Amino acid sequence: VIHNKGKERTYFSCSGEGILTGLHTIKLFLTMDNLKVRCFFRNENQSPSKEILGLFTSGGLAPNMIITNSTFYGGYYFKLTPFSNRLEWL
């Protein structure tokens, strides 16, 4: 982990459906029900694309969610699924 390495771009767009903020940033909210989110890789096309999902799935790549706190580290993996129907990761 290089802290000042530099990050000049954002690549994903996640949404909780339940609530959100300018999609520039991705903020989620917990309630009693399960936290279910739909996320898609963002490239020069801002809209969801069924080609990028197909590429990353045909390589065997799926996104990871990393939840961190002062004293916590947790990881949640998006289950690999065929891109025949899914337009974005869930």
């Binding site: 390589g59 065997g60 993996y77 690999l80």
Partner: protein, 147 residues
């Protein structure tokens, strides 16, 4: 005999230099076999350009039959100051990782083939002699096995 590496320097074309300095491994020489309940480890060494930041990715031909976990870690730097990155790939059968769905794994009784490739996602042109690393992996019978 056209020498494309030299032709990709015409000022009219105005290409951009390759962003990776080195990408090497011994995995390209031989093919590998994965038998039932077996796994293997592959290694590559990559050095980026002084200023550029290339993103390496690892892909497999058959994701239904083969699953991989790849780790990129920095270990020391060269004399010019470029950091050298070691990429370690743990490869095994898809059903054992557990992130795959029941329809994605598609059984385990059948043998299959795949090919694992370490590449650069944002590689430019002029990256002619810096070809991606590729290796063929057969998830099937181990010939030296005998009873």
């Amino acid at each position: 005999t056209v020498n494309v590496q030299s032709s990709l320097m015409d000022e009219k074309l105005a290409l951009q230099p390759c962003n990776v300095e080195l990408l090497e491994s011994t995995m390209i020489n031989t093919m590998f076999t994965i038998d039932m309940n077996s796994k293997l480890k592959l290694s590559a060494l990559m050095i980026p350009r002084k200023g550029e930041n290339p993103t390496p990715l690892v892909m497999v031909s058959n994701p239904h039959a083969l699953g991989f976990k790849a780790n990129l870690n920095e270990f020391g730097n060269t004399f010019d100051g470029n950091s050298k990155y070691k990429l370690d790939i743990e490869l095994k059968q898809q059903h054992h990782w557990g992130n795959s769905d029941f329809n994605f794994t598609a059984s385990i009784k059948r043998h299959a083939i795949s090919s694992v490739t370490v590449d650069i996602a944002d590689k430019t042109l002029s990256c002619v002699d810096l070809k991606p690393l590729s290796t063929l992996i057969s998830v099937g019978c181990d010939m030296t096995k005998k009873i």
